[PDB]
């Protein structure tokens, strides 16, 4: 079982992966997010957020509306399965989630909810294997 992934969000508005695999034997799964570069949170903060494919657009839209001081996430958003905080350069965060929260046949997406980042393709698939 490989139950973790290290991901980077950079000063150029990209993640260094667009596909995460979760071994289904993993009871829990960990995402270790870091931010190469030197842009601070208020300019190019990133987070890592997991939802169903169908819920992504909404989480993103509501997140942008919620604003930077709420880490670009609507408080108590039930569409959000797991998430890191918003981080700037030299910062890091991790999130660990229950792998049983991922159901068969469902499509999952990860993304950064910061204003316009996901549109710029800071997103990818998350898949149970
Ligand atoms: Cu971002």
């Amino acid at each position: 079982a490989e139950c973790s992934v290290d991901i980077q969000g950079n000063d150029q508005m990209q993640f260094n992966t667009n596909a995460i695999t979760v071994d289904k034997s993993c009871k829990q799964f960990t995402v270790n997010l870091s931010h190469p570069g030197n842009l601070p949170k208020n300019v190019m903060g990133h987070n890592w957020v997991l939802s169903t494919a169908a819920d992504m657009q909404g989480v993103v839209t509501d997140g942008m509306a919620s604003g930077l001081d709420k880490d670009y996430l609507k408080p108590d958003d039930s569409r959000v399965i797991a998430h890191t905080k918003l981080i700037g350069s030299g910062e890091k965060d991790s999130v660990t989630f229950d792998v049983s929260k991922l159901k068969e046949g469902e499509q999952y997406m990860f993304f950064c909810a910061a204003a316009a980042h996901a549109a710029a393709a800071m997103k990818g698939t998350l898949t149970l294997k």
Side-chain angles (χ1 to χ4, degrees), residues 1-128:
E2 291 173 59
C3 304
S4 68
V5 56
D6 295 345
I7 187 171
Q8 299 170 10
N10 69 7
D11 282 355
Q12 290 79 40
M13 209 178 276
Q14 72 220 172
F15 279 138
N16 68 340
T17 180
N18 52 23
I20 291 169
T21 306
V22 185
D23 284 333
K24 18 187 207 235
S25 55
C26 291
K27 265 30 209 70
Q28 285 177 134
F29 192 81
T30 300
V31 179
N32 301 315
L33 178 64
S34 63
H35 190 321
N38 207 45
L39 295 177
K41 193 165 62 179
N42 73 302
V43 174
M44 180 78 59
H46 304 303
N47 52 21
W48 185 97
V49 186
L50 177 68
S51 79
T52 66
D55 277 346
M56 181 174 169
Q57 177 177 8
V59 175
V60 165
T61 300
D62 290 346
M64 169 200 69
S66 289
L68 162 68
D69 294 312
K70 301 276 181 37
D71 277 13
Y72 285 116
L73 285 172
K74 202 182 170 181
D76 305 308
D77 191 335
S78 298
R79 295 163 300 187
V80 178
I81 301 174
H83 71 89
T84 68
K85 67 193 187 170
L86 194 86
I87 65 164
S89 60
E91 306 196 312
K92 70 193 180 157
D93 193 29
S94 302
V95 68
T96 295
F97 63 90
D98 173 15
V99 169
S100 80
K101 292 192 185 295
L102 312 177
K103 279 78 183 57
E104 304 94 333
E106 186 58 278
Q107 290 298 318
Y108 301 97
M109 286 289 297
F110 71 87
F111 51 96
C112 175
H117 286 206
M122 295 196 75
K123 62 184 182 170
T125 54
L126 184 140
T127 311
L128 270 179

